[PDB]
Design an enzyme around this catalytic site. Sequence first.
Site, PDB file in Angstrom:
ATOM      1  N   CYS A  55       0.822  -1.206   0.000  1.00  0.00           N
ATOM      2  CA  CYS A  55       0.000   0.000   0.000  1.00  0.00           C
ATOM      3  C   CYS A  55       0.859   1.260   0.000  1.00  0.00           C
ATOM      4  O   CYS A  55       1.661   1.479   0.919  1.00  0.00           O
ATOM      5  CB  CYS A  55      -0.943   0.033   1.192  1.00  0.00           C
ATOM      6  SG  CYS A  55      -1.993   1.505   1.199  1.00  0.00           S
ATOM      7  N   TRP A  83      -9.253   6.220  -1.027  1.00  0.00           N
ATOM      8  CA  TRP A  83      -9.531   7.002  -2.222  1.00  0.00           C
ATOM      9  C   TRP A  83      -8.487   6.636  -3.262  1.00  0.00           C
ATOM     10  O   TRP A  83      -7.431   6.095  -2.932  1.00  0.00           O
ATOM     11  CB  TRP A  83      -9.542   8.510  -1.932  1.00  0.00           C
ATOM     12  CG  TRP A  83      -8.306   9.051  -1.314  1.00  0.00           C
ATOM     13  CD1 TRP A  83      -7.125   9.278  -1.941  1.00  0.00           C
ATOM     14  CD2 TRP A  83      -8.128   9.463   0.048  1.00  0.00           C
ATOM     15  NE1 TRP A  83      -6.213   9.797  -1.060  1.00  0.00           N
ATOM     16  CE2 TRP A  83      -6.804   9.930   0.167  1.00  0.00           C
ATOM     17  CE3 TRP A  83      -8.955   9.483   1.175  1.00  0.00           C
ATOM     18  CZ2 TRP A  83      -6.283  10.417   1.369  1.00  0.00           C
ATOM     19  CZ3 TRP A  83      -8.439   9.970   2.368  1.00  0.00           C
ATOM     20  CH2 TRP A  83      -7.116  10.428   2.456  1.00  0.00           C
ATOM     21  N   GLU A 110      -4.288   4.131 -10.898  1.00  0.00           N
ATOM     22  CA  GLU A 110      -5.139   2.953 -10.732  1.00  0.00           C
ATOM     23  C   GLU A 110      -6.305   2.967 -11.703  1.00  0.00           C
ATOM     24  O   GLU A 110      -6.745   1.916 -12.176  1.00  0.00           O
ATOM     25  CB  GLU A 110      -5.690   2.893  -9.311  1.00  0.00           C
ATOM     26  CG  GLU A 110      -4.640   2.886  -8.230  1.00  0.00           C
ATOM     27  CD  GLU A 110      -5.259   2.716  -6.841  1.00  0.00           C
ATOM     28  OE1 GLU A 110      -5.578   1.561  -6.475  1.00  0.00           O
ATOM     29  OE2 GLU A 110      -5.440   3.741  -6.131  1.00  0.00           O
TER      30      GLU A 110
HETATM   31  C1  HEM Z   1      -6.206   6.571   1.825  1.00  0.00           C
HETATM   32  C2  HEM Z   1      -5.850   6.440   0.548  1.00  0.00           C
HETATM   33  C3  HEM Z   1      -5.268   5.135  -0.033  1.00  0.00           C
HETATM   34  C4  HEM Z   1      -4.562   5.106  -1.156  1.00  0.00           C
HETATM   35  C5  HEM Z   1      -4.202   6.324  -2.029  1.00  0.00           C
HETATM   36  C6  HEM Z   1      -4.185   3.736  -1.420  1.00  0.00           C
HETATM   37  C7  HEM Z   1      -3.450   3.280  -2.500  1.00  0.00           C
HETATM   38  C8  HEM Z   1      -3.174   1.962  -2.779  1.00  0.00           C
HETATM   39  C9  HEM Z   1      -2.569   1.449  -4.002  1.00  0.00           C
HETATM   40  C10 HEM Z   1      -2.173   2.301  -5.212  1.00  0.00           C
HETATM   41  C11 HEM Z   1      -2.441   0.127  -3.882  1.00  0.00           C
HETATM   42  C12 HEM Z   1      -1.867  -0.858  -4.910  1.00  0.00           C
HETATM   43  C13 HEM Z   1      -2.970  -1.325  -5.850  1.00  0.00           C
HETATM   44  C14 HEM Z   1      -2.375  -1.824  -7.147  1.00  0.00           C
HETATM   45  O1  HEM Z   1      -1.141  -1.684  -7.343  1.00  0.00           O
HETATM   46  O2  HEM Z   1      -3.132  -2.360  -7.993  1.00  0.00           O
HETATM   47  C15 HEM Z   1      -2.970  -0.247  -2.568  1.00  0.00           C
HETATM   48  C16 HEM Z   1      -3.001  -1.512  -2.061  1.00  0.00           C
HETATM   49  C17 HEM Z   1      -3.452  -1.856  -0.817  1.00  0.00           C
HETATM   50  N1  HEM Z   1      -4.057  -1.016   0.089  1.00  0.00           N
HETATM   51 FE1  HEM Z   1      -3.980   0.995   0.062  1.00  0.00          FE
HETATM   52  N2  HEM Z   1      -4.691   2.939  -0.402  1.00  0.00           N
HETATM   53  C18 HEM Z   1      -5.379   3.770   0.457  1.00  0.00           C
HETATM   54  C19 HEM Z   1      -6.045   3.325   1.578  1.00  0.00           C
HETATM   55  C20 HEM Z   1      -6.008   2.058   2.129  1.00  0.00           C
HETATM   56  C21 HEM Z   1      -6.722   1.630   3.321  1.00  0.00           C
HETATM   57  C22 HEM Z   1      -7.652   2.555   4.126  1.00  0.00           C
HETATM   58  C23 HEM Z   1      -6.426   0.340   3.533  1.00  0.00           C
HETATM   59  C24 HEM Z   1      -6.868  -0.617   4.666  1.00  0.00           C
HETATM   60  C25 HEM Z   1      -7.331  -0.170   5.843  1.00  0.00           C
HETATM   61  C26 HEM Z   1      -5.508  -0.067   2.484  1.00  0.00           C
HETATM   62  C27 HEM Z   1      -4.956  -1.323   2.345  1.00  0.00           C
HETATM   63  C28 HEM Z   1      -4.334  -1.777   1.209  1.00  0.00           C
HETATM   64  C29 HEM Z   1      -3.882  -3.127   0.981  1.00  0.00           C
HETATM   65  C30 HEM Z   1      -4.004  -4.292   1.988  1.00  0.00           C
HETATM   66  C31 HEM Z   1      -3.353  -3.166  -0.240  1.00  0.00           C
HETATM   67  C32 HEM Z   1      -2.703  -4.370  -0.936  1.00  0.00           C
HETATM   68  C33 HEM Z   1      -3.699  -5.404  -1.420  1.00  0.00           C
HETATM   69  C34 HEM Z   1      -2.862  -6.526  -1.976  1.00  0.00           C
HETATM   70  O3  HEM Z   1      -1.918  -7.006  -1.283  1.00  0.00           O
HETATM   71  O4  HEM Z   1      -3.135  -6.949  -3.124  1.00  0.00           O
HETATM   72  N3  HEM Z   1      -5.279   0.996   1.643  1.00  0.00           N
HETATM   73  N4  HEM Z   1      -3.408   0.890  -1.923  1.00  0.00           N
HETATM   74  C1  LIG Z   2      -8.056   0.690  -0.137  1.00  0.00           C
HETATM   75  C2  LIG Z   2      -7.475   0.891  -1.511  1.00  0.00           C
HETATM   76  C3  LIG Z   2      -7.348   2.181  -2.008  1.00  0.00           C
HETATM   77  C4  LIG Z   2      -6.815   2.388  -3.275  1.00  0.00           C
HETATM   78  N1  LIG Z   2      -6.705   3.652  -3.754  1.00  0.00           N
HETATM   79  N2  LIG Z   2      -6.434   1.327  -4.013  1.00  0.00           N
HETATM   80  C5  LIG Z   2      -6.543   0.052  -3.543  1.00  0.00           C
HETATM   81  C6  LIG Z   2      -6.140  -1.025  -4.333  1.00  0.00           C
HETATM   82  C7  LIG Z   2      -6.237  -2.332  -3.866  1.00  0.00           C
HETATM   83  C8  LIG Z   2      -5.840  -3.465  -4.750  1.00  0.00           C
HETATM   84  C9  LIG Z   2      -5.259  -4.633  -4.288  1.00  0.00           C
HETATM   85  C10 LIG Z   2      -4.954  -5.663  -5.170  1.00  0.00           C
HETATM   86  C11 LIG Z   2      -5.249  -5.552  -6.518  1.00  0.00           C
HETATM   87  C12 LIG Z   2      -4.922  -6.680  -7.474  1.00  0.00           C
HETATM   88  C13 LIG Z   2      -5.205  -8.023  -6.803  1.00  0.00           C
HETATM   89  N3  LIG Z   2      -4.021  -8.496  -6.063  1.00  0.00           N
HETATM   90  C14 LIG Z   2      -5.866  -4.399  -6.981  1.00  0.00           C
HETATM   91  C15 LIG Z   2      -6.169  -3.368  -6.096  1.00  0.00           C
HETATM   92  C16 LIG Z   2      -6.758  -2.565  -2.595  1.00  0.00           C
HETATM   93  C17 LIG Z   2      -7.164  -1.491  -1.804  1.00  0.00           C
HETATM   94  C18 LIG Z   2      -7.063  -0.187  -2.281  1.00  0.00           C
END
Ligand code: HEM
Ligand SMILES: Cc1cc(N)nc2cc(-c3ccc(CCN)cc3)ccc12
Lengths: 401, 402
Positions: B106, B278, B283
């Site tokens: 993240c 958000w 993305e």
């Molecule tokens: C507040 C603004 C947030 C932004 C801008 C953000 C952004 C992102 C981005 C860009 C990714 C990667 C997705 C991808 O590469 O396809 C991601 C993954 C992730 N986000 Fe954040 N996120 C936010 C909030 C959160 C919150 C609130 C949570 C949980 C409480 C969270 C948990 C996660 C997790 C667990 C992943 C990885 C999922 C995986 O392992 O596939 N995010 N987020």
């Molecule tokens: C909370 C949150 C915010 C954000 N801006 N992007 C996310 C993106 C993900 C995300 C996690 C995994 C994948 C691909 C499946 N592994 C795609 C998206 C999960 C959570 C997100």
Amino acid sequence: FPRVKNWEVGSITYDTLSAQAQQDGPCTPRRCLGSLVFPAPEQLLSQARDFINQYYSSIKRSGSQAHEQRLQEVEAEVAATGTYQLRESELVFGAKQAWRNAPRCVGRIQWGKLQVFDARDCRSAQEMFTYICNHIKYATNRGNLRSAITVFPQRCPGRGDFRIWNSQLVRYAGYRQQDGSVRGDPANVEITELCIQHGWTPGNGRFDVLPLLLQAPDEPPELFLLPPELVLEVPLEHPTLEWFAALGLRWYALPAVSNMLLEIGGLEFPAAPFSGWYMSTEIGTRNLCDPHRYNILEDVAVCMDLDTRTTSSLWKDKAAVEINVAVLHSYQLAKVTIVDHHAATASFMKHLENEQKARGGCPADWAWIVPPISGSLTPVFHQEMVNYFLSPAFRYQPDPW
Amino acid sequence: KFPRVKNWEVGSITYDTLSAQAQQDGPCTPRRCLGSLVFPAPEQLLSQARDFINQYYSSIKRSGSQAHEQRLQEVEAEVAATGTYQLRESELVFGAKQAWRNAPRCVGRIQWGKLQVFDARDCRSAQEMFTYICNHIKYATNRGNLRSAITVFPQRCPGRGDFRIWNSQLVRYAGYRQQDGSVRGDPANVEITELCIQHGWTPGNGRFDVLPLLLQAPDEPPELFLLPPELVLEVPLEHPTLEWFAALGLRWYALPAVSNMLLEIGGLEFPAAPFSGWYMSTEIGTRNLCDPHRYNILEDVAVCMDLDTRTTSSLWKDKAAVEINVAVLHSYQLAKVTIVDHHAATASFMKHLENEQKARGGCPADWAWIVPPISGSLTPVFHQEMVNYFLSPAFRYQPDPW
Ligand code: HEM
Ligand SMILES: Cc1cc(N)nc2cc(-c3ccc(CCN)cc3)ccc12
Ligand code: HEM
Ligand SMILES: Cc1cc(N)nc2cc(-c3ccc(CCN)cc3)ccc12
Ligand SMILES: Cc1cc(N)nc2cc(-c3ccc(CCN)cc3)ccc12
Ligand SMILES: Cc1cc(N)nc2cc(-c3ccc(CCN)cc3)ccc12
Ligand SMILES: [Gd]
Ligand SMILES: [Gd]
Ligand SMILES: [Gd]
Ligand SMILES: [Zn+2]
Ligand SMILES: [Zn+2]
Ligand SMILES: [Zn+2]
């Protein structure tokens, strides 16, 4: 055996070559260190035998008479002297395999077509300079670039190494200025310093080609100027932005790395410069846009009249793409070989398919294979990769100072 | 002893001591790295619970206090008498923020301490589930000024089925398979679209039809719940200077709300705990709209910009992707819906790495996922070395319920 998925196609392979990983990388089950830039006579015998068996397997002559006689020759020579020497054909096979095994190289579809210059009879710094000039001449080929490597004599204990002090054969000087900033390439302040302390008369341009600091065994480094007609250079111009030419940018045709150690069958060649041709993003993104390099991105964005007050207009991204367009256009106009990152990564995907049949896998470092701009728009972004160390190999080495 | 981590743009060096707490084993070994893979009883529970309790009491500076001893005793006793234990509300809040703070992939973790935690552990039916979810969506959306939130439903417990949300996100567009083999709508959602249809949904035939929710109460078949259209805030996509872009008919939704991960806290498992933040703009523009298995608009935009598409050396793909991202950022800002660009998001992640070095002696981060999918080297995280490892509390993947 690791499972490896291409998420674009849905296709699955298993990497069985990794089972034969020579030495240990930096990762453990507790934490992954995959983004880190730098992680006995019995031992030499064991590597020499491994390598000789590899060579004789690759030509389908394992267990042949020649195979047995070569192993016996190496056993006798290692016993008598502590080392051995490679036949020319083994050296050629070894240098190709080291390229083929280089996990961070996206250009490996070309691994079979490498020219190997045997410079192992080299005796002096002057003679070393003659070999390096022949190499640059052959590799440049009036802009129709050709992959090549020149192998200087091997390390042997109790004797000094041949070394090339420069990190690449062609590099632009970087003169530290009165106010703590650099004029020229800042990646080269220390090598520019060493050149002046060894009698070089510096310039003051942004694109002054450095001399060669060459070191024969146990003799100190000797300064050698490269003839200007030998270093092919490309002025940078843009197809539609007529003002781009006025920035006065340029780059050289030939990426020729000269600070790595070639390792073949337990032997080490500390001076083994090799070259191919550029991928555009190396010039456009790394060398011209990195903040610690020429750092031109802001200047280009001004000339494009972009709103550089907010990151959300994506002015950095717009400016970066046009710089890369200018690089491609200028190299093709000048008839100097270059490849864009889309063509490069597509050919690397074909190299992975070829390598799976030939060897059951391919070591690849994902963070260096994915290009530094437009990553997910290329086919390697969604390709899972396995990274491990095979021999023969190129390796980093301490600086000669 | 501890991994040394260098930033090659500044020259600064830190040593990651927090990796010594790594509570799991990843896929890598000394002989090969697999860091690019996408998807790599009583005393087992008691040991995970005690470690979580120790974290909580260390965080409020009260380690070794009487409350810390008494809470350890209580949890030991509860697990002995019943096989499980209950989190106090304050520990559940701490646990959910830690799971976000620990997510290596993240990039938006600077915000981790401002998570809004909704406690739905007293939920009893699917209708009650839908009510909590609709409140989550309304709170998180906040009419465009987005706010981070997590709703956590009852933990998994022996003797009772799980609560589950079958949808991978609260808001997803349908994918309908066409007789010619292609897909109308989002191709990543063809499977959940078919399921909604089997469980009674009357499909549409558009490119951006919002799917209903499939909600499963303990030991019940799932039930369909239509999201009231006024609840799902959507942004029509337009370009500031390319007027034909609006004619593409593209839209996206405001709220990314992941609903299929399992939250794990102190050996307790919450299989239904949707969370939302958000979007970062790459993305939407790069992944959702340009990936070949998604809406796949790159070449049609490139033709409309009048770019030479027969050769790759015009870099038409890169020019078209930048303009799609420009349109996304412009559209969300026009509609006053929160969005961050990848330059701002990565700079704040760099700030987060500094904060975490002072706080915990490190930060786990998956380089391949932190570096945005376009313009990688133009951001400060590209030249920043990073250490990846698994800490708990944590979000994790779980098998699909069907
Ligand atoms: C507040 C603004 C947030 C932004 C801008 C953000 C952004 C992102 C981005 C860009 C990714 C990667 C997705 C991808 O590469 O396809 C991601 C993954 C992730 N986000 Fe954040 N996120 C936010 C909030 C959160 C919150 C609130 C949570 C949980 C409480 C969270 C948990 C996660 C997790 C667990 C992943 C990885 C999922 C995986 O392992 O596939 N995010 N987020
Ligand atoms: C909370 C949150 C915010 C954000 N801006 N992007 C996310 C993106 C993900 C995300 C996690 C995994 C994948 C691909 C499946 N592994 C795609 C998206 C999960 C959570 C997100
Ligand atoms: C023929 C065209 C070639 C192309 C397009 C090419 C491309 C590249 C690129 C783009 C990189 C990474 C750049 C970076 O991230 O800094 C690289 C690294 C590398 N290349 Fe190739 N290369 C070519 C030829 C060769 C040859 C002939 C050799 C050796 C015989 C070679 C060996 C290597 C090695 C060892 C590295 C890793 C260097 C390091 O880790 O510091 N390449 N190459
Ligand atoms: C032979 C060859 C061809 C090419 N197009 N690029 C290279 C790029 C490199 C290279 C390797 C590493 C670095 C950064 C220092 N680790 C910079 C450049 C080495 C060899 C190359
Ligand atoms: C994480 C990562 C990926 C990648 N493709 N190249 C990097 C290149 C560098 C790098 C930056 C500057 C230098 C100059 C010192 N040889 C060498 C290497 C650092 C990190 C990188
Ligand atoms: C190597 C790598 C890096 C990264 N940042 N994202 C990826 C995303 C994927 C990916 C692409 C598509 C899907 C959809 C199928 N669940 C899932 C994962 C695969 C590899 C990735
Ligand atoms: Gd000999
Ligand atoms: Gd002007
Ligand atoms: Gd216009
Ligand atoms: Zn690893
Ligand atoms: Zn760089
Ligand atoms: Zn993708």
